[PDB]
Design a protein around this ligand. Structure first.
Ligand SMILES: [Mg+2]
Ligand SMILES: [Mg+2]
Ligand SMILES: [Mg+2]
Ligand SMILES: [Mg+2]
Ligand SMILES: [Mg+2]
Ligand SMILES: [Mg+2]
Ligand SMILES: [Mg+2]
Ligand SMILES: [Mg+2]
Ligand SMILES: [Mg+2]
Ligand SMILES: [Mg+2]
Ligand SMILES: [Mg+2]
Ligand SMILES: [Mg+2]
Ligand SMILES: [Mg+2]
Ligand SMILES: [Mg+2]
Ligand SMILES: [Mg+2]
Ligand SMILES: [Mg+2]
Ligand SMILES: [Mg+2]
Ligand SMILES: [Mg+2]
Ligand SMILES: [Mg+2]
Ligand SMILES: [Mg+2]
Ligand SMILES: [Mg+2]
Ligand SMILES: [Mg+2]
Ligand SMILES: [Mg+2]
Ligand SMILES: [Mg+2]
Ligand SMILES: [Mg+2]
Ligand SMILES: [Mg+2]
Ligand SMILES: [Mg+2]
Ligand SMILES: [Mg+2]
Ligand SMILES: [Mg+2]
Ligand SMILES: [Mg+2]
Ligand SMILES: [Mg+2]
Ligand SMILES: [Mg+2]
Ligand SMILES: [Mg+2]
Ligand SMILES: [Mg+2]
Ligand SMILES: [Mg+2]
Ligand SMILES: [Mg+2]
Ligand SMILES: [Mg+2]
Ligand SMILES: [Mg+2]
Ligand SMILES: [Mg+2]
Ligand SMILES: [Mg+2]
Ligand SMILES: [Mg+2]
Ligand SMILES: [Mg+2]
Ligand SMILES: [Mg+2]
Ligand SMILES: [Mg+2]
Ligand SMILES: [Mg+2]
Ligand SMILES: [Mg+2]
Ligand SMILES: [Mg+2]
Ligand SMILES: [Mg+2]
Ligand SMILES: [Mg+2]
Ligand SMILES: [Mg+2]
Ligand SMILES: [Mg+2]
Ligand SMILES: [Mg+2]
Ligand SMILES: [Mg+2]
Ligand SMILES: [Mg+2]
Ligand SMILES: [Mg+2]
Ligand SMILES: [Mg+2]
Ligand SMILES: [Mg+2]
Ligand SMILES: [Mg+2]
Ligand SMILES: [Mg+2]
Lengths: 209, 120, 122, 56, 114
RNA sequence: CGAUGUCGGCUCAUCACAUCCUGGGGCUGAAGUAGGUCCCAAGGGUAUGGCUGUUCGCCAUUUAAAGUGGUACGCGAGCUGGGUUUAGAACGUCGUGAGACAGUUCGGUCCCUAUCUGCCGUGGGCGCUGGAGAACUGAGGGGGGCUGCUCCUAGUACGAGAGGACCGGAGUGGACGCAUCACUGGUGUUCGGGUUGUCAUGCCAAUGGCACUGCCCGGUAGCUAAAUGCGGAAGAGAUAAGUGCUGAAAGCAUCUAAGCACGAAACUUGCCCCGAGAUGAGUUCUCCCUGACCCUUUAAGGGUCCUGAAGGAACGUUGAAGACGACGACGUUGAUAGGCCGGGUGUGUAAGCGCAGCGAUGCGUUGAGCUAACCGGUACUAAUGAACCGUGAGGCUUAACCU
RNA sequence: AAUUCCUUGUCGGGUAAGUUCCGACCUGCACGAAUGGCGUAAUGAUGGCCAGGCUGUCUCCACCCGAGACUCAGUGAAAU
RNA sequence: ACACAGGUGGUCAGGUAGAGAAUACCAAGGCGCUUGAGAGAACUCGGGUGAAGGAACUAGGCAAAAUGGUGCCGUAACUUC
RNA sequence: AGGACCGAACCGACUAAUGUUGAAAAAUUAGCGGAUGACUUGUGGCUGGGGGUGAAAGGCCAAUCAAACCGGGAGAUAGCU
């Protein structure tokens, strides 16, 4: 359902009156402006496209400026799309704010995780290292065996090997929301979220709930 | 992995790197212009400009610190007497780098690095 | 923390002094146990008079550890050694009638209220 | 590990298809000296962006 | 990090006495209970301090009943309630971790005269 | 037999179901709890040690359970080398002897830079029919799916008692997986300090080099687990074993022949990720180009001049992006990197001077000095006027309209 | 038992659990007196077993410092 | 076979610390080892540190870690004294 | 005094790793044994192949030893590939 796009400011803690420390992640959720509304006639689906501002003018190409000229007249870092469920809320130039999350108790939070680049075995798939002494010859972090024998005569698909790790979108699936403060574009959620500081993320009410 | 780290190894150990940067800083202070590789100059900036900032203020303790970090009375004296007042009112950016092609022996990118005032 | 082959001091007047952990009870593949967790031990020192002797195999509960406990306050409580109170193999009740050294709030549960009462501090 | 069959000149050329060099195709000129030079690099004479480097 | 800084000031406390490593402090910790909330005393030598604004902490070693019993307090927490200094030791060090193996009469710290 | 390396272990697995646990049922010589046997079910899960070279086995001690098999008795161009088929030596035994034992005993070289298939990642080219910048749909594929204990129902149903539920709710754990450094910690040869030997800066003082970073004590950022957040689901559809309603053949009966209803961790979906090379190459929005002329074998023809758009590429400053490509930000109409300013953090009272003391040393100036990767600012330095690529309205036939 | 197939013989000790080890039993398959028998202080880069300390051997790996691996320039192999 | 981390007899031999011709830093003297420049990925090699546990590893404490000097005190069974 | 003790030069080669188209047709690094004696080493000499030498391993006799190397009988023979 309708969600918002925010930036990861960092992590901190909140102390409650009952002596409990809650670790929270600060998400800056500025105003999101609707730039386009998809419907079932022109497109085959009902959704809305939104943007968050703070983009310079000389870096906006003519196609993007023309796209924004549709009652948005304000460029943003990028465009995101949210599938629109029932309700049929006002769409064009509505400028949804963080107040939308003033009643929800759970959020999913999607973002691009930190990029390791190398992964490597052991670190990527929690493989067990072979021994370090007792003769081991140049085989400590190596994977080991990758196939049975002549009978299969090959290596199966999906075999766990060394490659790229991180730098891919991940969801956290129903985090808890602690505080939603207005006049500051802030949303505090318990726990950690994927990505580094200053990275963009998509906050969306939990579907499991 | 390297995340938010600074300083490059130059394929050397710490002691060799420190000695090389000390010698290069002394040479740059003495000659006001030198020919070196681009990464080496980019690293030498962070070693040489702080010395000029330290020399901005003259005191016995600052002289001792500069001598600890350079180990050459000649260039220490050139500081606090010539390079101090020459900049004085300039806030950072005492050196500039200019690419100057490649080196014949190994095709390494080369660059001049020199003080901005250029002895004028 | 507290795993198999770990040597623990004794914090009650059972006359054992030193014990060795031989199993971490509760769940399969469980690695180590913290404070307030039942473990299987074997006696090693067994002072003469005592109430038990060397080679006995019975239960025990960890009351002090060098790693400590965090709990929601965010604080930590570390100790200089690992200690436990011997328990009956079947009834799971303490054998000794005295408790030495401080204990920690995680022993507040119903099962160890006698240990809580007998402890000198906390 | 060594080859079991001798690969062909066709495979050799297919592999080398990615070995072609690339030209700079970008030689900027200095409005003073007039010399063509590699961009962001000083000129062979000693000029850069009009000014004469290697001088007082 | 203006946002984070301004968020932390809202919880930072204004009644933290200036205590140094090697000083003996007395911390009154709240003991939560159904309807028996009350203070509890903890006295010991301060062996380490960590200054991180709202994330500040300090370690106190009590050495009770023959065991060291260390305790790490979060300075800006509602459970610490209050803290007071009873002695002023001279140690010319930031971390007193050697007291872990020192113990005995060698664990005493000379008072700081002023 | 012009060589297919053999037992056990380690690492990594994948399939079957004749099912060990979990799930659904019939029967019971099933009162309850707990059991026995059979049927359906392969989604997930399925122990650490002692002894032995030991797979197996016995033992101790856990678990819901510690399944049976195939895969060259899976796996040595992945590892080991304990057993076992070389050369040394000894015991028992056999032989006159050289020697032998499928008897024992001590010791005893494990090579290979990956061409092709395969697999894990990441790119270039062309295509998708004018070109370009974005957001999508989703054919298809992959990941995930485990389970204990405590409490309520309830000391209730059941039972003489002891004992003790099904169904339905709540909480807290084990193992596993994903993410992240707010906390607790590790590291932190780029920060501070102590100290031994020796050399040097003319000497004192103060510093630097070397000795594993000389040794050692702390410790920023980053990365990290032991640290802390989350997950497995609910729901829906069609079913397996099984249970049925109505109902003839066969006046009764019958779950079945016509018809109708329930029914499991299996199947489809729901959850997460990839995904239009999906050549079946999809959809939506936006942006750019609308000048002449010559020739021929005269049709998706060739050529001269003028023109060069949208955008891209290249170059430079770089990144919590990265083997290289790639990807992201910035290029003076600028905070992209370095420097500088302020702060923070760490270390722990710098040097010089003064006083006390014969001196080591202590006290004041002084929580001083220094301080990497951090935070907030600042054009001081470096990111150039340009050049390069990419064009000039985009085929044919038919269908519905304007002519 | 450097000797014993049956065999991990039986008993005792050690461990929590000991086909190994130590002490006995004697049913010596198949010990035995210069192809020497039984002991023996000291000695051993000798074989077996146990304990203290110590530890990344391990539960379970994490970070860091250098040399390669990777990219650019020069030279330039090999088995098959 | 090489401008090859191998082998090759004799003589001289300074300072500080040190028992020392060991070891560390130096003097006289001689050298930086005939491809470089970048980056800071798996994996390999050579090293440093490590929370709690401390042989649970393994055929086997293999390898690592640990002990380590001078003076004085003190020191068991057994013994060929 | 000692085929005495610890430990450099010197002589060895017990463990591990690396290397295995090597830096090297047995070496490098870290440990390890002897180190006044049955010790080690330079120069020269003697023992010659069914022979020599051997604190004995069928070991060594010019990177070759259950019978060295060079030349010859010799185009040995090969019911075998
Ligand atoms: Mg990265
Ligand atoms: Mg393992
Ligand atoms: Mg090897
Ligand atoms: Mg940086
Ligand atoms: Mg190099
Ligand atoms: Mg050094
Ligand atoms: Mg073939
Ligand atoms: Mg063949
Ligand atoms: Mg079946
Ligand atoms: Mg399913
Ligand atoms: Mg096999
Ligand atoms: Mg198998
Ligand atoms: Mg294989
Ligand atoms: Mg094998
Ligand atoms: Mg063997
Ligand atoms: Mg699947
Ligand atoms: Mg941090
Ligand atoms: Mg720390
Ligand atoms: Mg330092
Ligand atoms: Mg001095
Ligand atoms: Mg020197
Ligand atoms: Mg030296
Ligand atoms: Mg369901
Ligand atoms: Mg009928
Ligand atoms: Mg800047
Ligand atoms: Mg401070
Ligand atoms: Mg100082
Ligand atoms: Mg036997
Ligand atoms: Mg044992
Ligand atoms: Mg015996
Ligand atoms: Mg005999
Ligand atoms: Mg006789
Ligand atoms: Mg290479
Ligand atoms: Mg090359
Ligand atoms: Mg060839
Ligand atoms: Mg050479
Ligand atoms: Mg040589
Ligand atoms: Mg010699
Ligand atoms: Mg490295
Ligand atoms: Mg290593
Ligand atoms: Mg170490
Ligand atoms: Mg350190
Ligand atoms: Mg440790
Ligand atoms: Mg420790
Ligand atoms: Mg220990
Ligand atoms: Mg084992
Ligand atoms: Mg060893
Ligand atoms: Mg060692
Ligand atoms: Mg001797
Ligand atoms: Mg000796
Ligand atoms: Mg040998
Ligand atoms: Mg050696
Ligand atoms: Mg000796
Ligand atoms: Mg023989
Ligand atoms: Mg020979
Ligand atoms: Mg013959
Ligand atoms: Mg003849
Ligand atoms: Mg012939
Ligand atoms: Mg024949």
């Amino acid at each position: 359902m309708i969600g918002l796009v925010g930036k990861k400011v960092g992590m901190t803690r909140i102390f409650t009156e009952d002596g409990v420390s809650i670790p929270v992640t600060v998400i800056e959720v500025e105003a999101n402006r609707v730039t386009q509304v998809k419907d079932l006639a022109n497109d085959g689906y009902r959704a809305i496209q939104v943007t968050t501002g703070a983009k310079k003018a000389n870096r906006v190409t003519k196609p993007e400026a023309g796209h924004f000229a549709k009652a948005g007249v304000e460029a943003g870092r990028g465009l995101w799309e949210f599938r629109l469920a029932e309700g049929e809320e006002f769409t064009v130039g509505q400028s949804i704010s963080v107040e939308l999350f003033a009643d929800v108790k759970k959020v999913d939070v999607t973002g691009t995780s930190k990029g390791k680049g190398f992964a490597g075995t052991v670190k990527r798939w929690n493989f067990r290292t072979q021994d370090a002494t007792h003769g081991n010859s140049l085989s400590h972090r190596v994977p080991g065996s990758i196939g049975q024998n002549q009978t299969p005569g090959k290596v199966f698909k999906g075999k766990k090997m060394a490659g790229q790790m991180g730098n891919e979108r991940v969801t956290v699936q129903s985090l808890d929301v602690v505080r939603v403060d207005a006049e500051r574009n802030l949303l505090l959620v318990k726990g950690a979220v994927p990505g580094a500081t200053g990275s963009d993320l998509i906050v969306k009410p939990a579907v499991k709930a | 992995m390297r995340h938010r780290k600074s300083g490059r190894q130059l394929n050397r150990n710490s002691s060799h790197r420190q000695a090389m940067f000390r010698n290069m800083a002394g040479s740059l202070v003495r000659h006001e212009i030198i020919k070196t590789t681009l990464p080496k100059a980019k690293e030498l900036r962070r070693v040489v400009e702080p010395l000029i900032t330290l020399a901005k203020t003259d005191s016995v303790a600052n002289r001792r610190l500069a001598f600890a970090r350079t180990r050459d009375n000649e260039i220490v004296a050139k500081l606090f007497n010539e390079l101090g007042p020459r900049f004085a009112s300039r806030a950072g950016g005492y050196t500039r780098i200019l690419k100057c092609g490649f080196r014949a022996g190994d095709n390494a990118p080369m660059a001049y690095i020199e003080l901005v005032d250029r002895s004028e | 923390m507290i795993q198999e082959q770990t040597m623990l001091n004794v914090a009650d007047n059972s006359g054992a002094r030193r014990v060795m952990c031989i199993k971490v009870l509760g769940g399969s593949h469980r690695r180590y146990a913290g404070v307030g967790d039942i473990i299987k031990i074997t006696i090693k020192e067994a002072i003469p008079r005592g109430k038990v002797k060397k080679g006995d195999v019975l239960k025990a509960v960890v009351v002090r550890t060098k790693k400590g406990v965090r709990r929601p306050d965010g604080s930590v409580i570390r100790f200089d050694g690992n200690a436990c109170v011997l328990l009956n193999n079947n009834s799971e009740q303490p054998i000794g009638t005295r408790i030495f050294g401080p204990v920690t709030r995680e022993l507040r549960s119903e099962k160890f209220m006698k240990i809580i009462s007998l402890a000198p501090e906390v | 590990a060594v080859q079991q069959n001798k690969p062909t000149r066709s495979k050799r050329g297919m592999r080398r298809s990615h070995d072609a060099l690339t030209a700079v195709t970008s030689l900027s000129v200095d409005k003073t000296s007039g010399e063509k030079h590699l961009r962001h690099h000083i000129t062979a004479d000693g000029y850069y962006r009009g000014r004469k480097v290697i001088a007082k | 990090s203006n946002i984070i800084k301004q968020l932390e000031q809202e919880q930072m406390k204004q009644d933290v006495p200036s205590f140094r490593p090697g000083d003996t402090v007395e911390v009154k910790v709240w003991v939560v209970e159904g309807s028996k909330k009350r203070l509890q005393a903890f006295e010991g030598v301060v062996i380490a301090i960590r200054n991180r604004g709202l994330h500040s902490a300090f370690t106190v070693r009590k050495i009770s009943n023959g065991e060291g019993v260390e305790r790490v307090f979060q300075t800006h927490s509602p459970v610490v309630d209050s803290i007071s200094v009873k002695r002023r030791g001279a140690v010319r060090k930031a971390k007193l971790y050697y007291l872990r193996e020192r113990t005995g009469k060698a664990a005493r710290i000379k008072e700081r005269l002023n």
